[PDB]
């Protein structure tokens, strides 16, 4: 019934902090903690993301994770840092050094005992834990390394519980790390066999939203983090608010994952219009379902024409009738059968929730298990092979104790993943 | 009336926050059905 959240690394902590700001938006929770929600529909399922206190206030059920205390510093000194529980803040004396090895085996291992402590209390203090949520980036040192250590370390203790990762996938054009392929591969092979859902968020798409969709003059990490936060709020709005066709994370996983290793998804948000063009757009079910499958509103930069859609999930929020949403969503498949998997009837499942986000007519979160992900996995694998070919930054990882064939095993896992993607892409009836 | 949250002062409250299955914002019983909680 409840989702317990974890933020890892600088990216994960910042995104989670502004995500908790977003959550407090429609749950009417002050930065201090007091609840002044206008309606009790914001208190109906506030226990999913919040744990009550004696003073009538509510605490995020979130654990923070970073070898760098600076991101905790910014989060706690920020506008909504009042909200987080103090003891959940877990940090070390030295940063990860942007190294997966340091974050996963040396600096994170000596620190993850307290993380297990705090997450276990937060996990078994609830009536019926629905699942675990993690927010991190696969190109970082402690977000990827310690995040995957947490994921694998919690999977064994909670096997039946659904556990998901909002991985902020990296890209060479926005590469702020040169150990990007190493970290991405070492995180993704763990996420493949340790995560039920691993949704992918790409910085190039995040910024192309800020120009080609928003026309923002000065877009910032605040805006990017709010995009990711709106994605996070939309993926679980149905648990917290009533709807005509309810869904939960287990149902989303069942409807989006055809095969156990096929749990990486496209993401998209709508409506998104530039502030100067919101006059002229007639915001309706057709417009939202168009914006779902419009390039300007996808959260990851890949070309879906080269691939095929195994499954997709459309989480609509707002007052709508199912009569037009289901017919529109079958309509798109009817004339896009050249871009959808044939052997699966009705590749996309829809869910309707009545409560819309504050200040929005109606929203929709798009989660797509498209097979174009193999293109970007191949792109990261090529640079990983090039780097591994010449000890390129390999000694940093090997000096922390990782054996050399770890990278070979990770690359074999990625090769198997892309091969499976390609063969389910070109499989016929 | 000015709502408690400063963010929702510019928004529609009663029509927006109302489930399609279901106008007073207050649901019938708190401690018995949904707001059942410790303390």
């Amino acid at each position: 019934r409840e989702i317990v959240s974890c933020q890892a690394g600088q990216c994960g902590n910042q995104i989670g902090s502004k995500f908790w700001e977003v959550i407090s938006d429609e749950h009417g929770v002050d930065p201090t903690g007091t609840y002044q929600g206008d309606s009790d529909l914001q208190l109906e399922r506030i226990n999913v993301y919040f744990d009550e206190s004696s003073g009538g206030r509510y605490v995020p059920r979130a654990v923070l994770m970073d070898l760098e205390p600076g991101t905790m510093d910014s989060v706690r000194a920020g506008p909504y840092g009042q909200l987080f529980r103090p003891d959940n803040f877990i940090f070390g004396q030295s940063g990860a050094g942007n190294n997966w090895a340091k974050g996963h085996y040396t600096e994170g291992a000596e620190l993850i005992d307290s993380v297990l402590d705090v997450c276990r209390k937060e996990a078994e203090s609830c009536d019926c834990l629905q699942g675990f949520q993690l927010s991190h980036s696969l190109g970082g040192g402690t977000g990827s390394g310690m995040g995957t250590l947490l994921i694998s370390k919690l999977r064994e203790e909670y096997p039946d519980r659904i556990m998901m990762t909002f991985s902020v996938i990296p890209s060479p054009r926005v590469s702020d790390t040169v150990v990007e392929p190493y970290n991405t591969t070492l995180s993704v092979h763990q996420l493949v066999e340790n995560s039920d859902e691993s949704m992918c968020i790409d910085n190039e798409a995040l910024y192309d939203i800020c120009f080609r969709t928003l026309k923002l003059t000065t877009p910032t990490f605040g805006d990017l983090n709010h995009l990711v936060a709106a994605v996070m709020s939309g993926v679980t709005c149905c648990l917290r608010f009533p709807g005509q066709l309810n869904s939960d994370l287990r149902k989303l996983a069942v409807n989006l994952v055809p095969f156990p290793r096929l749990h990486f998804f496209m993401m998209g948000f709508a409506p998104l219009t530039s502030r100067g063009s919101q006059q002229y757009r007639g915001l309706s079910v057709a417009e939202l379902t168009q914006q779902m499958f419009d390039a300007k509103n996808m959260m990851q930069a890949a070309d879906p024409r080269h691939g095929r859609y195994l499954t997709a999930s459309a989480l609509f929020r707002g007052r709508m009738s199912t009569k037009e949403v289901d017919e529109q969503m079958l309509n798109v498949q009817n004339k896009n059968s050249s871009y959808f998997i044939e052997w699966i009837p009705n590749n996309i499942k829809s869910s309707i929730c009545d409560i819309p986000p504050k200040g929005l007519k109606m929203s929709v979160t798009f989660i797509g298990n498209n097979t174009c992900i193999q293109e970007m996995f191949r792109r990261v694998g090529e640079q990983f092979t090039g780097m591994f070919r010449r000890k390129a930054f390999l000694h940093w990882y090997t000096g922390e104790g990782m054996d050399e064939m770890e990278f070979t095993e990770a690359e074999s896992n990625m090769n198997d993943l892309v091969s499976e993607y390609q063969q389910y892409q070109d499989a016929t009836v | 009336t000015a709502p408690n949250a400063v963010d929702s002062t510019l928004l529609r409250l009663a029509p927006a926050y109302e489930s399609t299955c279901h106008h007073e914002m207050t649901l019938p019983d708190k401690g018995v059905t949904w707001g059942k909680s410790r303390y």
């Binding site: 003059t217 000065t218 502030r275 100067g276 919101q278 006059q279 915001l283 200040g359 007519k361 | 510019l10 928004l11 529609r12 029509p15």
Partner: peptide, 25 residues
């Protein structure tokens, strides 16, 4: 029809005050 008139009124109100804030920027 009147309800969705009021809905569009809310949308336009939020949007244009945000525009005013952007010009203040």
């Amino acid at each position: 029809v009147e309800e969705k008139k009021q809905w569009s009124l809310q949308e336009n109100m939020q949007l244009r005050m945000a525009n005013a804030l952007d010009r203040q920027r």
